[PDB]
Symmetry: C4
Subunit: 217 residues, 4 copies
């Protein structure tokens, strides 16, 4: 019976049939947005949702027995399981994030399609040469998130009153979004030397980011 199932799984019709349910339930998940649509075809949708998430469990089961241990060493296969299991976590009795993360079952399209795999693998190959840099940045953020908290968190609780709130504000300053008019110009109305903290932080952070972009080449 194994060889019987093995032929169905690895057939091109099988893979194509899975892509069919993705693009369908992908559309099906995207019309659950419209409250108007949900009045007419609300029942049509949730069933097909349960239908598709059920079939993908079957498909992911066959891929196991066909590949055995080879299945649970394939990231694209493990992804599917978690991403199907998320969709399998009960519809109710819990935070709606799980019902939302059910839409992650639409990322399953990159698994079924090999052309996307090449795009994805090409990018992840860059991550190795960047952990040397990312780690340094995180220590830099952590050291300065400490300083900003015990510097400005007294008069500015919403931006720096908490080690975490300082982290959030500092990432925004990195992105440069309202760093001056939004945060530093007001900060300077109380601490006039605040620019000594943030201008070099922007200098340093930008220089490193540029090096990382150049590092990739």
């Amino acid at each position: 019976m194994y060889l019987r199932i093995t032929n169905i799984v690895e057939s091109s019709f099988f893979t194509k049939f899975i892509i069919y349910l993705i693009v369908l339930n992908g559309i099906t998940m995207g019309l659950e947005t419209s409250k108007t649509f949900m009045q007419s075809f609300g029942v049509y949708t949730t069933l097909f949702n349960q239908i598709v998430i059920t079939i993908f469990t079957i498909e992911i089961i066959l891929r196991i027995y066909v590949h055995r241990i080879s299945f649970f060493k394939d990231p694209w296969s493990l992804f599917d399981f978690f991403v199907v299991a998320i969709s399998l976590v009960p519809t109710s009795s819990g935070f709606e994030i799980l019902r939302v993360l059910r839409v992650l079952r639409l990322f399953r399209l990159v698994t079924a399609v090999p052309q996307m795999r090449k795009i994805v693998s090409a990018l992840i190959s860059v991550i190795p040469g960047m952990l040397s840099v990312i780690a340094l940045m995180t220590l830099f953020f952590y050291i300065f998130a400490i300083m900003a908290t015990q510097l400005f968190g007294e008069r500015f609780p919403e931006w720096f009153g908490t080690l975490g709130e300082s982290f959030y504000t500092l990432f925004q300053v990195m992105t440069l979004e309202s760093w001056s008019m939004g945060i530093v110009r007001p900060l300077m109305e109380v601490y006039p030397y605040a620019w000594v903290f943030f201008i070099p932080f922007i200098w340093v952070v930008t220089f490193v980011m540029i090096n990382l972009v150049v590092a990739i080449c």
Copy 2:
């Protein structure tokens, strides 16, 4: 057949068309001034009717001379569509067409071969990005769904609609007011909103850098 071919391929012919381009280009840019259009309104719309008439003749001649070679030249197809657009009556129809008359000034890139190379150099890059662009669009689509059914209830203006989420997420991609404008307000209601957007901005930026590196290398 040979009679028209000499007129069409004469260098004055090419030069004469560029003259009307730079003329109607100026002429189209003076239709901006309400002052100018009160005195010389007739002189211009006639000159527009004059120019659109000559360009119809010009676009006719190049057809019979090249036959299928005309409708296989992208630079020629552009001219045809963009002149045909301008031919829809000035008042009959949505006034949008009267605006799209200004697209006939891009025909200068067609008429000039030096521009053709610059434009072709950039469009030639798009192929190596459709493999990537498509992935980006899928990423946007999955998150536009999540953001919609997460924040669209209390925030209809930004996420109440699958389309509105797309706009906001492209805005967040551009980093414009993403924090003080969008996420900070969301966090006043959903304190874990930063878990949604900080990794999103990471992914969006990471792919953009990879796209730049691909073009540079």
Copy 3:
């Protein structure tokens, strides 16, 4: 008698002394910012300023006769000449812009110092391969500045009421600064399809900028 002046001009003390006055009047121009300073040492500065423009008038004369036609064919010399001539325009009579552009005489440090010339020339060397691009962008902006004017200049005069006014706003959209919350989101409350105009405009403009960066890196 001619060759006598030629030795002084190209002497290293001469070259160094001008830089001495550059960094001097450069500092002197930067204390004219302080209203406090200008009450006590106003004469000390404007005189030293008048002193500097006098010596720099002399120096720019000497370099001419020594170089003859080579002076008015050396951009760095023409620059000096124009930038000192600006400083030579009378202190009064005329727009104060000239008194401000007198501070351009501090750019004279880039001419006098040769190491900067290479740094500057390294940047200008990039300009040739980009005029092919800059020109297209200007045509791209001009076509869209027209549309924005005759699209939104009716209900939105301060952003698009004028072909020039449209140029400014569109340049802002290029920088992505407040393009959405500032311009497109308000426009959409009046013209709901405004995003069809500005979202791709950003795409093309950004795409071209990226290619330009890649072009320079190669």
Copy 4:
């Protein structure tokens, strides 16, 4: 007994022991943030702080005599020394900034870890080929900070009323953050040709940044 200290210092446990205390007081320094935490283990922390900074004094002492002058020629060692010396400055005497700069002793992890040194040295190595440009950038800012001050600092003191205020605003304009809606659009409502000042300033500043990136590329 010169060789006696050298073996302990050069032991891998010695290097590892310092790295352990870095990551420890690093956590401890980040728990001094919570006002809640400081009520329970506040004393436990301030004691542990004095403990750690005392041990790091010992370590920085041993490495000296073992290395003699070689210690004060090692940047990574000088850093450790200076950054520990800060923590030795009295806890309450002087501005509380000193109590904050105690957290810089967590950058000593980049020193203590050799894998980081290569990354950091790789980045600092880029800075030399940029001082040719960085200096030019600084002069450009300096010349324009003066002009903006005596142009817009009169009606707009908060952004340009002071040579320093102009510098900050110009760096703000450089970062492009609210450069248009925040600074130039208000400026133009009073000085309508203010855009002639800032649009090319942005062009040059933006153009140089790419060249700086290209400098990093080449």
